Amino acid sequence: SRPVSVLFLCTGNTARSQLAQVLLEHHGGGRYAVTSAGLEPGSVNPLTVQVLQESGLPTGHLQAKGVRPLIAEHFTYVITVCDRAEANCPIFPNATYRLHWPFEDPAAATGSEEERLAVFRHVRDEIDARIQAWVAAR
């Protein structure tokens, strides 16, 4: 049985959408074909990598990538993980369902590395929870 296609959509594809991609890869297994992309791609935040690796989740395949090369693709679910109020939080044209799971931008948090890592861990855990519940309802 072929997998359900999911695009996690964000601003820079550096944090929330990368966390979501890896967490759905983990909890969903082969049931989902998972992509993440951003409107204005940056670079995966090192704290994104750190908090995933702390959980034993691999990150070597993560790359910040733009949504423009995907504009002709269709996804059964497009799940926007930036707040629509954020600048460069985009919309995607080809989807069956558009879900909006705004999460706090962990990369916007300030303070020491340890204080920022705490925010990244909190957002990781929130995304993890939402993904577990979403997979379980299917």
Numbering used by the authors: 6 to 143
What's the paper's own text on this?
D. indicus contains the typical arsRBC operon that encodes two regulatory proteins (ArsR1 and ArsR2), two arsenate reductases (ArsC2 and ArsC3) and an arsenite efflux pump protein (ArsB). In order to explore the difference between the two species, D. radiodurans and D. indicus, to the arsenate resistance we analyzed the arsenate reductases that belong to the ars operon, which are able to convert As(V) into As(III). DiArsC2 structures are composed of an α/β domain and four parallel β-strands which are flanked by three helices and two small helices. The reduction mechanism of arsenate involves three cysteines, Cys15, Cys87, and Cys94.
Thus, we undertook the structural studies of DiArsC2 and we were able to crystallize two different forms of the enzyme: native (DiArsC2) and bound to arsenite (DiArsC2-As). The crystal structures of DiArsC2 and DiArsC2-As were determined and refined at resolutions of 1.65 and 1.50 Å, respectively. In the case of the DiArsC2-As structure, a disulfide bridge between Cys87 and Cys94 is formed. Although the protein was co-crystallized in the presence of arsenate (AsO43−), the density observed close to the catalytic Cys15 suggests the presence of AsHO32−. This molecule is located in a positively charged pocket and establishes a network of hydrogen bonds with the main-chain nitrogen atoms of residues G17NTARS22, Thr16 and Ser22 hydroxyl and Arg21Nε groups, as well as water molecules. Moreover, the arsenate is located in a positive-charged pocket which is accessible from the external environment. The DiArsc2-As structure represents the final stage, where Cys15 is bound to As(III), however the ligand cannot be released since Cys87 forms a disulfide bridge with Cys94. Since in our DiArsC2 structure the disulfide bridge between these two residues is not formed (at least in chain B, where density is observed) this could indicate that an As(V) reduction event already took place in the DiArsC2-As structure, leading to the formation of the Cys87 – Cys94 disulfide bridge. The lack of mobility of the PTPase loop (where Cys15 is located) together with the high flexibility of the loop that contains Cys87 and Cys94 suggests that Cys87 is the residue responsible for the release of As(III) bound to the Cys15. In fact this loop is readily accessible by the thioredoxin reductase system to reduce the Cys87 – Cys94 disulfide bridge and allow a new As(V) reduction cycle to occur.
